[PDB]
Design a protein around this ligand. Structure first.
Ligand SMILES: O=C(NC[C@]1(O)CCCN(c2cc(NCc3ccccc3)ncn2)C1)c1ccc(CN2CC3(CCC3)C2)cc1
Lengths: 201, 242
């Protein structure tokens, strides 16, 4: 079901097997670098990302030591890292905005799982140039690159906020407004697994 | 304005649309710099330990296959270099990793040699002069690759992490000279080694070692004489001692 969908939840505890399989997964995790809704390294590792796809791509935002820890999780979850997008952060006049250098960019690992068929690989390039909005807000251009890469397929975002919900996407995060599911297969599996609408352990 | 869509529409890379004193420091660096020293050597067949003394900074630029689209070194060869045998206990490394598997195998190297990554420096290539040049993608690539990474590593106890220049002509393997400015501006010490440098990269303040050098002037005792007391611990960013 095409329009935006979402589940307010603790991604640690949600049974993501009810959601089906996805052509693309994106995660923007609250990494435990230098806490708020932070996940520990073991919690990140233990996330049941493996059930979410059979053949497709994972997009994983990383910074600081999560550049390395995100490569661990990525490989543990069964992905090969095949690309790395960087978003050059500018102001409204297209000027550019770790204690050794100042940081002009954010990193997004791109991992592949299985043998994705029918994706439009090579349409975009691996550099995004886009204006910073608010803190920890990723650029909307990534959704366009993902849509051109895999048009019309089902996608899922982990650790999204309400501004992140998009058609073709199911957004998970603990700061969303309730549950909002429209895909019947998902709705069925959700009622069966959660007859009282509660997500506990 | 979505520059990714624009790239898809026109072939102009999004980085084409990015726009854009204490240079006394630069002059201190130049006054501190040792004479340029250089040595032809086949680093495959060469006992790295002959390069003394231990280095404060190592710039490592192995010639990857991906640099020749139209002898190359594999990450298998690079990982086997005994880099930790010539690094000072406190020292820094700058490793050009390319844009493919090197972003992972380069991290393995840094750990193998005893460093931890503190910076990820991206060399972002504009195509202002040939928007009509499509890129033949690596089979595994999801996206057109328009950048290279130079990983910075630390072991022991002004600048941004981006370099933007125009994409060099095919067959040009040179990295942007700006990496040297970034490195020298850190003021990390004066024992600076460039492995796999070329005639064209020789530079004051640096010892260059590579297989294609046409000439050599390296002498280990001459080289060590530049850092004997009272000059053992200079950053490279201070006055000479009278
Ligand atoms: O804001 C973010 N994400 C929304 C959250 O809502 C926040 C609160 C936490 N979060 C949980 C956590 C959770 N379980 C753990 C838990 C639950 C309750 C109490 C303690 C721990 N389950 C479900 N969402 C996710 C966020 C975090 C980092 C970055 C970094 N980016 C900057 C960047 C973007 C691209 C450039 C990369 C950006 C956005």
């Amino acid at each position: 079901l095409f329009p935006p969908q979402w589940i307010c939840c603790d991604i640690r505890y949600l049974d993501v097997s009810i959601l089906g399989k996805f052509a693309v997964v994106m995660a923007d995790p609250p990494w435990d670098i230098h806490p708020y809704g932070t996940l520990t390294d073991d919690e990140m590792r233990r996330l049941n990302i493996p059930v979410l796809q059979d053949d497709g791509f994972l997009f994983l935002w990383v910074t600081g030591r999560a550049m390395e820890l995100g490569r661990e999780c990525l490989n543990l979850w069964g992905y090969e890292r095949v690309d790395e997008i960087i978003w050059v952060k500018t102001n409204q006049l297209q000027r550019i905005i770790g204690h050794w250098l100042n940081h002009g960019k954010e990193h997004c690992l791109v991992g592949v799982k299985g043998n994705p068929q029918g994706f439009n690989q090579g349409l975009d390039c691996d550099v995004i140039v886009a204006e910073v909005r608010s803190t920890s807000h990723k650029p909307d251009e990534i959704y366009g690159m993902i849509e051109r890469l895999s048009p019309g397929t089902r996608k899922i975002e982990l650790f999204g906020r309400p501004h992140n919900v998009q058609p073709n996407w199911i957004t998970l995060g603990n700061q969303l407004d309730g549950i909002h599911l429209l895909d019947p297969d998902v709705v069925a599996r959700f009622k069966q697994r959660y007859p009282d609408g509660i997500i506990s352990k | 304005n979505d520059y990714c869509q624009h790239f898809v529409d026109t072939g102009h890379r999004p980085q084409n649309f990015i726009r854009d004193l204490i240079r006394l420091k630069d002059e201190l660096i130049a006054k501190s710099n040792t004479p340029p020293m250089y040595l032809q050597a086949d680093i495959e067949a060469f006992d790295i330990r002959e390069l003394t003394p231990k280095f404060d900074v190592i710039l490592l630029e192995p010639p990857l296959e991906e640099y020749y689209r139209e002898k190359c070194w594999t990450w298998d060869d690079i990982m086997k270099l005994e880099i930790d045998e010539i690094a000072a206990p406190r020292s820094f490394i700058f490793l050009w990793c390319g844009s493919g598997e090197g972003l992972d195998l380069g991290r393995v190297c840094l750990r193998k040699w005893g460093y931890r990554r503190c910076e990820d420096i991206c060399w972002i290539k504009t195509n202002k002069n040939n928007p009509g040049k499509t890129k033949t993608l690596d089979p595994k690539a999801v996206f057109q690759r328009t950048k290279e990474h130079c990983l910075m590593g630390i072991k022991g106890t002004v600048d941004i992490d981006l370099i933007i220049t125009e994409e060099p002509e095919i067959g040009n393997i040179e990295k942007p000279v700006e990496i040297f400015h970034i490195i020298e501006h850190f003021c990390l010490g004066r024992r600076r080694l460039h492995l796999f440098g070329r005639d064209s990269t020789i530079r004051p303040g640096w010892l260059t070692v590579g297989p294609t050098l046409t000439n050599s002037n390296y002498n280990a005792e001459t080289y060590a004489s530049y850092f004997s007391a009272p000059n053992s611990y200079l950053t490279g960013c201070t006055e000479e001692i009278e």
